[PDB]
Amino acid sequence: ASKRALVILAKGAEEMETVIPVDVMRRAGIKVTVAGLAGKDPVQCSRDVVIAPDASLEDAKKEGPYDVVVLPGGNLGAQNLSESAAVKEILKEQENRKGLIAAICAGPTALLAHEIGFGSKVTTHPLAKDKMMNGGHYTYSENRVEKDGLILTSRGPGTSFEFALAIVEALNGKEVAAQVKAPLVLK
Amino acid sequence: ASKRALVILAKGAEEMETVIPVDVMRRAGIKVTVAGLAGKDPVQCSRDVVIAPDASLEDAKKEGPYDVVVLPGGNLGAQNLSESAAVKEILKEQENRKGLIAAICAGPTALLAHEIGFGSKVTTHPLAKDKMMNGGHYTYSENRVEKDGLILTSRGPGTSFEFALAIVEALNGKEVAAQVKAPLVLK
Numbered sequence: 001a002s003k004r005a006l007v008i009l010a011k012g013a014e015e016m017e018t019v020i021p022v023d024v025m026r027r028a029g030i031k032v033t034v035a036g037l038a039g040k041d042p043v044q045c046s047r048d049v050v051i052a053p054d055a056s057l058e059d060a061k062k063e064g065p066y067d068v069v070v071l072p073g074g075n076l077g078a079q080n081l082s083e084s085a086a087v088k089e090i091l092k093e094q095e096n097r098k099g100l101i102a103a104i105c106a107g108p109t110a111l112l113a114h115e116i117g118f119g120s121k122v123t124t125h126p127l128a129k130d131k132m133m134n135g136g137h138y139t140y141s142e143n144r145v146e147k148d149g150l151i152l153t154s155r156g157p158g159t160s161f162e163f164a165l166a167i168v169e170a171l172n173g174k175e176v177a178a179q180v181k182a183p184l185v186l187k
Numbered sequence: 188a189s190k191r192a193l194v195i196l197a198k199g200a201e202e203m204e205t206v207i208p209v210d211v212m213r214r215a216g217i218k219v220t221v222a223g224l225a226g227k228d229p230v231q232c233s234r235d236v237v238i239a240p241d242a243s244l245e246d247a248k249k250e251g252p253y254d255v256v257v258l259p260g261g262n263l264g265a266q267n268l269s270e271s272a273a274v275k276e277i278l279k280e281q282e283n284r285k286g287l288i289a290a291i292c293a294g295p296t297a298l299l300a301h302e303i304g305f306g307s308k309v310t311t312h313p314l315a316k317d318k319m320m321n322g323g324h325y326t327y328s329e330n331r332v333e334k335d336g337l338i339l340t341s342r343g344p345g346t347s348f349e350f351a352l353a354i355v356e357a358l359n360g361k362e363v364a365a366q367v368k369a370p371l372v373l374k
């Protein structure tokens with residue numbers, strides 16, 4: 001049976017940080033559900049790219065559990081994720097069942113909002129560091145991708161490939177990650 | 188006045204190679220029109236990401252001229268671009284007015300189909316090389332981004348940032364490209 005990923009898509013999400021992990025995870029044979037936070041309608045991302053989700057979060061959250069829950073970044077997208085009761089419940093359940101949670105850029109600040117993974121070493125976009133570190137509940141890292149147990153974080157659009165391949169390695173192993181990596185023409 | 192970019196979006200396009208240049212060009216203050224080859228309806232990309240274009244190509248082609256015409260890759264997307272009479276006319280006009288043409292991955296094989304920029308040094312995805320080189324009308328390069336006059340080409344999803352920043356530099360200069368680059372957290 002294939003692994004399953006939930007990607008939560010909110011208005012203002014960084015479109016690069018959404019599409020790169022979805023595409024790379026699907027190249028890895030992961031069944032990815034792109035779920036719209038606000039419903040089934042297409043979502044307007046931070047730059048003006050409009051993406052139609054596979055399902056509403058309301059529906060997708062009923063089709064769990066997922067092997068990874070992925071939170072894209074983008075300053076306003078992450079604020080929307082941080083304010084959502086549905087996201088809070090999903091992340092708490094994932095943390096409780098010891099499943100992987102992956103967040104990139106401003107995405108990890110939603111972990112702070114929902115009190116997820118306190119005590120973890122994490123990274124974020126450099127501009128999101130102060131928000132993430134409010135209260136000192138995490139230890140900050142400048143690694144391009146950071147993984148502390150079941151909390152996987154990354155820094156920005158330019159780390160999106162490394163972030164996505166780290167999810168693939170965590171779920172499907174190093175060999176699959178290497179196979180997926182080669183045709184991408186990475187440096 | 189701001190520069191203007193036309194990005195032509197066909198079914199089967201590589202979504203990463205579409206979104207990365209659109210996002211980076213908009214960060215550069217370029218007015219980007221994402222135009223759907225087949226009409227105004229949302230487009231199903233190679234992995235299963237659905238993107239809603241800003242306009243139909245039929246409408247957008249009437250609002251030229253553009254400072255750059257951008258062709259995303261993806262094997263089936265590029266085949267669709269190669270078969271289109273509207274694309275042929277747009278590229279010929281752009282070539283005739285000495286405007287920039289930028290194509291990534293399998294995208295450059297549409298230049299071959301429409302007899303654009305013969306004699307140029309070009310690169311493509313490694314798997315698209317044989318198709319591009321059919322007849323020997325170009326000289327092949329393994330550079331991650333290649334620019335020969337007004338023909339700008341690149342190799343794949345992992346070269347998309349370099350490709351997009353090269354478009355920005357060509358249109359808006361090195362200083363703007365450097366400013367846009369820094370917050371992306373590239374290596």
Ligand SMILES: [Cu+2]
Nearest residue numbers: 014073074105
């Ligand atoms: Cu970001």
Ligand SMILES: [Cu+2]
Nearest residue numbers: 201260261292
């Ligand atoms: Cu490609």
